[PDB]
């Protein structure tokens, strides 16, 4: 009787959920220790770091255990309820918007702090910066209220009455769904993508023409060598952002762009396995934003093993 149950076998399922659980534990412990560390002068970048860390901690701890509890093992008869599903996708879309806007404004603060630094001394202040943190949180909530305006419950049994056939799906029509998730992918992926990539290439270009041309001794090429390690910590953040938040948004828009005429059974199976892959990559990003901020800089490595042990 339970139709619309996909036959996903248990070996790949337990491999994916083991990847998920390892990702979750290392990501929540990393975001916990970096949030407590930044909770432990021009300190206008620590707020962006802590805000992105809190956004990653929030998306992990709110989506991921509920995600394994009612998305990979327990299929279409769910157990979280109407307010549960609507608030769950509200928090998911809000955390995605918050992580995207955190990448935007962190890259903007870096660009003002290097390529126009006197305008950062004039413009950027700790008070304003806290105002911008509250502003991007309120922008995430205001852009996630259409996720409250688009979600719902829908029975898709043989007569639409069975309590083992109701799913929690976008209940709006295909066109308005297209529009909301297309502006979702457009803003919350592409404008972060071009903004973070353009400003990080300009910052890396300014650093490379500051250490190569040098307008003096480079200091036996030691501090500028770790400045090229800073080029690595720039480029690694931007490539991690694009390579993690690209396929999730491609999967959202391939859910929008197909209207059952291009779906087959194998493409249904491939869509569900690709959904496990893209949410694996989202939890990858949620784990390796604090891991990228921790491991590649040895001072963070020492102080966080001092926090751990």
């Amino acid at each position: 009787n339970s139709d619309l149950d996909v036959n996903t076998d248990i070996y790949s399922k337990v491999l994916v959920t083991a990847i998920y659980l390892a990702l979750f534990v290392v990501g929540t412990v990393g975001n916990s220790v970096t949030l407590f560390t930044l909770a432990r002068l021009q300190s206008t970048v620590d707020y962006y770091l802590g805000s992105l860390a809190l956004s990653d901690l929030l998306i992990l701890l709110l989506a991921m255990p509920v995600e394994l509890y009612n998305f990979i093992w327990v299929h279409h008869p769910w157990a979280f309820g109407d307010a549960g599903c609507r608030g769950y996708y509200f928090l998911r879309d809000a955390c995605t918007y918050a992580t995207a806007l955190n990448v935007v404004s962190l890259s903007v603060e870096r660009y003002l702090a290097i390529c126009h630094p006197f305008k950062a001394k004039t413009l950027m202040s700790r008070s304003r910066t806290k105002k911008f943190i509250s502003a991007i949180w309120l922008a995430s909530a205001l852009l996630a209220i259409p996720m409250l305006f688009t979600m719902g419950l829908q029975n898709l049994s043989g007569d639409g009455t069975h309590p083992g056939g109701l799913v929690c799906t976008p209940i709006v029509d295909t066109a308005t769904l297209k529009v909301v998730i297309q502006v979702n992918t457009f803003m919350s992926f592409l404008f972060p993508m071009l903004v973070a990539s353009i400003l990080n290439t300009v910052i890396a270009n300014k650093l490379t023409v500051m250490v190569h041309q040098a307008a003096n001794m480079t200091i036996e090429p030691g501090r500028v060598q770790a400045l090229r390690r800073g080029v690595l910590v720039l480029r690694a953040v931007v490539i991690a952002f694009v390579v993690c938040w690209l396929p999730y948004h491609v999967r959202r828009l391939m859910f929008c762009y197909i209207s059952d005429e291009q779906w087959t059974t194998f493409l249904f199976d491939f869509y569900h396995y690709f959904y496990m892959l893209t949410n694996a990559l989202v939890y990858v990003s949620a784990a390796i934003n604090p891991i990228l901020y921790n491991l590649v800089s040895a001072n963070f490595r020492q102080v966080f093993l001092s926090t751990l042990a």
Binding site: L4, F71, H76, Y89, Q154, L156, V167, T169, P170, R252, F255, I258, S259, D260, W263, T264, T265, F268, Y271, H272, Y275
Partner: peptide
């Protein structure tokens, strides 16, 4: 046969 999970 359209997927429902987003």
């Amino acid at each position: 046969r359209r997927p429902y999970i987003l």
